[PDB]
Design a protein around this ligand. Structure first.
Ligand code: FMN
Ligand code: FMN
Ligand code: FMN
Ligand code: FMN
Lengths: 399, 399, 400, 400
């Protein structure tokens, strides 16, 4: 029998990553409050999650990785997000970054992992950096904002633009060691506080050519690492859908938790002004129902989208324009529904739900934060998909 | 690779029912306009659909039936609805009625089908009839509204209440031959005109005990036909989810077609006033995108819900309270989203789209009609699901 | 003097207000509604009743025997009227608001139309499809001119077209032409507002003299041939467009307030077909009636405020600035949008019986949606218009 | 005299309207907003500025030196104020509206409060949690009384509780008590409207004499001990509740209008972080700015019309009937809902940077949502209130 309201446990001989997550969820949940005030992932959380080996979800097998299918991984993040959004978000990123690193030169991966198999990377992909072409590579300078989990990373992946002959943009990534940059703690946010999305500062950082890949190359299986893992079900696939797979996941995790948390607080709710017993009043019930439907519908769409990714990966098959448009955008619609579903409940939650000591207020905030990311902006997404459906050239103004 | 915007063709060897539908879809589509003025399904359409054997979708195998899985059938109705909603709707009902007949006595099924293997039944399940208990059965009298396809049926299934010693409602159905009732043609509607939902008139109709089953019995596998088909993947299952499976189906069919129809008419559109080519303007695109997303999300939820029906059927497993609530209501949420998606497009359609000679106007009407059936009313559904989620006793005021 | 949230308040005038006069004839209009739908135009009775109370002279200059009603007072008669037959209200509103435009043409033209017959009115078709040849003394116009509400009951038609400069740039103009110069082609088969008789005008080598031709821009800025003719008037020193298009939102509002009333009446006694239960007062129904009431009351407030602004401007002989003009162009579109939300919220709890031919809701629902399909009520266009203005951007010549 | 859609119109009444006086001090209020949020109450400066212009005497009777402002004029001050610091506006609104209620108590009580100190104000906690013993001459009340906006700046508190009939039915009453009779407990750690200082009052064996106790029903129907005291006043012959709860929607509107302005400012120069192109004027953004503008203008129209209704009623010393009362109870709830939709439509295009502590939007978004979480602004309850009334049903004693 299927389950509509949450992740179904892959019954497998040998216990699943998702069960392993489920056992440690109470601890995560209890640190949630002190994680918010810490403005990063508490050391305990990292240690627990790494202990179950989650961070090696997308690490190639040759280095001791699991190579989880997207669905299985997504669902761990969703489940995780239910307990601490910021943790789930940050940790998702640390994880999905290995899937990218896996497309770089064999030499780079060897450098990172043969040395330390538990090493991970945070990122800052927005190309703010000023780049000088020296011989052998580049020198990069810049302030690189928004690096979730950067405190717990040994490397960072960093985005920038290079130019060819007709000084055209060549969008590239560089992997750099933790010693090459300072973490500046300017992370004072109002949602997903626990993700530690501090900013990386880069001063005359040299990056050799072998730690630099073209984005386009990693979208189309032409990067230096292509063909390295001929048996893998997850590497013969565009880098971006994976890396960005966390946002919607976290968002959905929040939504499903909101429903549960709202239901718990709803049962016993009294009317301040009259004293009457009001937890089972029809309006409340209808909201719980509709939000349940809405996130169930969102989970269906994400589940179907993830299956699509998995199937493609299995078959070592790069998607076409249309499927690519859908993979870029369905997640944004999912995120959008999930927020509608959180809002519908928060709106019936009453004043007490906005107190610091109430969980709803944090879920509500975090939920909204998931729709503020560049990759989840639905205005941009509607235009992307739309243009594709009418068979129009893409707008280079968005991506 | 998965498909977001429509039914995926089950790549069997040989001809799937769905391909067979797809080949006849142009003809159905061309009769659509004269079907609307006919106020019932044109004889051609019935003949074409019966020829491909679709009406035997849920007929037991022993009488020459196919015993299609719910998903496979649902998807034929969705596809069909894209060409003529009223046809798809009416015909869906004529089909899903066999699934119910199949739970009646062996004697009844023998009576209907050994005699004529192509016979089908229309229905009127709202218990308006006055019922006298005579010995050996009942005499029923009543005007029975809303019998989709009743012009093309050889039997009608007809709902009524019988009473205990306690004098409590026992909701029952009776199958009655076409000779036992007059079709009154009072079907003047403003949507799904082609369904021929005329009203059955019953005057002192006698119904023998063997043509009468309790609804509750068919919900719980206790009706006279339980056990008859020990190998069947579709009869060990409550009757209602199958019978009502066509509404959301039709509704989805209509939505997917709107998006196609809108896109076609959109390309070349000029502003009436300023005379400007305007088919590719950003707002239109964004509506095409989001309606696309919306119905895709609906399709995902229905596809997931149907899988759940299929799985249960396979395992001869009757669902529990919770899954039952979800099966009762997810369809209603799907219908709701589908109508939102139609409305979002009809609203950018401009005045020309409301002309009799435009398809959009019919799709828009028919789409709305699908949310007006008793089983798809979302207000009632949210209350049903809601009460279940909070662990409340059901409200006998709705069902 | 308590305010009223759910409908037009009756102006205590001297003598009998136009709105009371409408209110007395509303039953008759309402009883013809069903046969008007099958007639595909306004029934002769309705025209005769409405003209008898003098409504068609709502915007006719006083010198010819007109009333010169303020926008709010007129709008509110349409809203009320629309409650009984949307198509009648819509058609008739147009026949009415056309005089306000005629009043900006040459004194000679007005004299021609009204000194001859004071009850004469005009239908229109303003979308510039016509092919236009510049002959000397005026133009020859040819074209099929769609969508002329009330055109069966009109003696003239106002017709839109483009002329060109030296430099070949569009000069959007209107011409008033007699009923004898065109054929009404009956291609009006619609699924909403059937009774408006929006048939299409056919024009074959119609000659139009220069004096029956005004520039749209001139009528927007008080520069047309009729500017200054009525120095005491509270309604002519004002751009033509806001008035002419004032009817759409009005009708749309009329339909919404009526839906609420109609839904309430049918709701009381409603049963579930399935359970047998008397279900008219169930909390979900109540909440929908409430929220639809709030939503249309909120639309009414925005329209009433917008109308006041038109009135105030007209009083002061003051042409609005860019910002107010943007608001006048678009507030009505938002109102129309809310009204349709309000109708939908109710039709969605209406059940299957409400979609029958013999039910009023089905008509109101259809009509309500038709009011948001007009080119002037399209909200996507309006959001862009108002948006550009608020950010201080040049207007998009792509829409208007 | 041209109307304004996007904000309060300045009442031209020459000399300085209260609203102008507000507008001059708004920059200061705005600059303290950030440190007010961390203070979790209204900064002493803000109180001092606002009291200096005399705003707190908005509803104080004239005999004590009050202004007796009309509801519209006051409401609009709160709206304007809320644009700069919601929590200030909210708290101060309450301190203000409480005088309107005090004005219905015995002449002796008002004399006690104001003849002594004419600047004295009261905070409240109206939810009847208190346990109440009937002693002779009055009551002894005990309880923890949550949510007392501005309670740090008040000299008295108004406190709600239930007493009982012969056959012991709830008699809902209010008691005014001096600041010495209760402790302020600082448990106010919220995530919205932080600056309102809505701390909780603790009451230990507080004695309340009969003359500082009024029945709520009496103050709803002009039967309280202070009825008739100000025979010339335009604002006291009116149920107490619509005035006291007038601030919430007002604040909520204030925040919305400010969101639009704030969003517009930040939108202009917004690049993509991803591609590299002036993204501030993209069509989606424009349309959201447009539609939110329309939505809050429509909300403003409904509140403005509702306020006028209160004003007209007050003028005429006329207590409203069931229907208008249902509307006054609920329109504000709809207004608040629209305002939050409008805020959300913008916050959703605002991008990640808008959720930083150093961004104003994030605070506006939070505060905006908080206004819809009060017991009087809950729309579910409101739809059921209005709905039942419209269908002519007895009220549900389960909500109020
Ligand atoms: C109910 C209906 C009646 C109309 N009546 C008139 C009319 O009498 N005169 C006129 O110029 N346009 C009329 N219009 C047409 C519009 O002005 C405009 O040309 C049309 O809405 C263009 O929309 P489109 O993009 O669907 O073609 C009417 C439109 C509809 C909605
Ligand atoms: C398009 C249309 C077709 C219908 N066809 C049938 C049918 O054939 N058999 C049936 O028992 N009920 C049919 N129903 C009626 C519903 O089962 C139910 O009686 C009706 O929705 C009651 O809704 P109401 O509250 O408006 O009466 C149909 C309803 C509509 C929407
Ligand atoms: C921002 C905030 C401030 C409030 N300030 C007051 C106040 O000063 N006086 C008062 O009686 N109630 C105040 N209320 C509390 C409400 O009157 C009511 O008791 C509370 O909203 C009950 O809602 P609940 O169901 O969440 O408990 C306030 C509520 C919130 C939203
Ligand atoms: C919660 C939060 C965490 C983020 N974490 C990262 C990250 O770790 N790496 C990264 O490259 N971008 C991250 N982003 C930033 C986005 O990729 C992007 O630069 C940002 O959303 C731009 O949006 P804006 O238009 O508001 O500037 C994050 C954004 C938010 C919503």
């Amino acid at each position: 029998r299927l389950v509509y309201t949450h992740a179904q446990t892959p019954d497998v001989s040998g216990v699943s990553m998702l069960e392993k997550i489920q056992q440690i969820l109470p601890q995560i949940a209890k640190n949630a409050e002190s994680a918010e005030q810490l403005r990063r992932v508490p050391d305990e959380n990292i240690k627990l999650l790494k202990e179950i080996g989650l961070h090696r979800a997308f690490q190639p097998k040759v280095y001791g990785g699991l190579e989880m299918s997207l669905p299985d991984f997504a669902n761990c993040i969703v489940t995780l997000a239910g307990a601490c959004a910021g943790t789930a978000w940050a940790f998702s990123l640390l994880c999905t970054h290995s899937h990218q690193i896996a497309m770089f030169s064999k030499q780079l991966q060897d450098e990172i992992w043969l040395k330390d198999p538990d090493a991970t990377a945070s990122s800052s992909i927005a190309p703010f950096g000023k780049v000088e072409e020296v011989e052998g590579g580049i020198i990069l300078n810049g302030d690189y904002g928004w690096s979730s989990g950067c405190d717990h990373a040994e490397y960072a992946i960093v985005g920038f633009n290079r130019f060819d002959a007709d000084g055209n943009k060549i969008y590239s990534f560089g992997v750099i060691p933790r010693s090459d940059y300072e973490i500046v703690d300017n992370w004072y946010a109002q949602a997903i506080k626990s993700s530690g999305s501090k900013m990386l500062k880069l001063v005359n950082v040299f990056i050799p050519e072998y730690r630099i890949s073209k984005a386009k190359d990693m979208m189309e299986g032409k990067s230096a690492g292509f063909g390295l893992y001929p048996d893998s079900k997850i590497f013969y696939t565009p880098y971006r859908p994976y890396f960005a797979s966390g946002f919607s996941a976290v968002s959905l995790g929040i939504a499903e938790r909101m429903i549960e948390a709202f239901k718990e607080k709803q049962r016993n709710r009294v009317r301040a002004y009259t004293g009457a017993n009001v937890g089972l009043a029809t309006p409340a019930l209808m909201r719980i129902a509709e939000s349940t439907h809405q996130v169930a519908a969102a989970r269906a769409l994400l589940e179907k989208t993830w299956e699509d990714h998995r199937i493609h990966g299995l078959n070592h098959q790069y998607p076409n324009k249309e499927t690519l448009a859908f993979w870029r955008t369905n997640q944004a619609y999912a995120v959008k529904m999930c927020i509608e579903a959180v809002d519908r409940l928060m709106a019936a939650a009453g004043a007490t739900s906005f107190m610091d000591n109430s969980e709803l207020q944090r879920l509500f905030r975090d939920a909204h934060m998931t729709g503020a990311h560049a990759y989840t902006d639905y205005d941009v997404c509607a235009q992307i998909l739309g243009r594709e459906l009418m068979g129009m050239e893409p707008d280079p103004t968005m991506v």
